[PDB]
């Protein structure tokens, strides 16, 4: 599965995005502190890109929040020039995430090293992880 077995998710109303910012402690901390009112559900785990990255998987209603807003937030919460990934669940979302990254390039001095890939796998208890990169809202 590309979807966690525990997450609240309705295929007929909701969408998914899987986010790596270098530590799921940071990724979860940030979305739950700023956007908790606007997302459906949120689960920490390990994502594989089509070597596992620590990720947060976000279930959301497009009529409540768009992917653009979720990605604009993502590029504000951590340093993506430096571990940094966006895992798309559709081909339409893949090209939109790439578009957003391009738009964010000048603001980060064109050094964004964020990887954009289709989602290959997702786990929760798949039972680095040594440190969390700095997570906070940049201005």
């Amino acid at each position: 599965s590309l979807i966690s077995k525990t997450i609240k998710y309705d295929p007929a109303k909701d969408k998914l995005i899987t986010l790596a910012s270098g530590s799921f402690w940071g990724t979860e901390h940030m979305y739950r502190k700023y956007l908790n009112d606007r997302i459906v559900d949120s689960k920490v785990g390990y994502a594989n890109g089509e070597d596992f990255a620590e990720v947060l998987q976000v279930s959301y209603n497009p009529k409540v929040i768009t992917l653009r807003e979720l990605t604009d937030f993502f590029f504000r919460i951590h340093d993506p020039t430096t571990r940094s990934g966006l895992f798309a669940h559709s081909d339409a979302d893949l090209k939109e995430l790439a578009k957003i990254k391009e738009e964010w390039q000048p603001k980060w001095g064109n050094k964004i090293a964020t990887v954009i890939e289709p989602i290959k796998n997702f786990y929760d208890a798949e039972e680095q992880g040594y440190a969390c990169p700095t997570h906070y809202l940049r201005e």
Partner: protein
Amino acid sequence: MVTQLKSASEYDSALASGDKLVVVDFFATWCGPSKMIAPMIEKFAEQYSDAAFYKLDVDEVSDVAQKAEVSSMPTLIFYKGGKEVTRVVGANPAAIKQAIASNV
């Protein structure tokens, strides 16, 4: 005991120590690894008397964190004579213990 640093003022006047080694744990309360290194540094503080151990919340005192160029937690920084001698990034207690032993 490990003394928490609350402002840049406390931090500076902790570096002004002399030959005694100064260890600072730069931490985040949300960060799992950073949180779990705490009890380990507490034990090293108990074992190494001649060293003064401190902790600093990077969200609380962002100015010191940015100035010491800490971009990950935990980051244990080691000071002698008010100047950096070495640092260990990430939650490896055995690595941290070595840096203490090697520096006093």
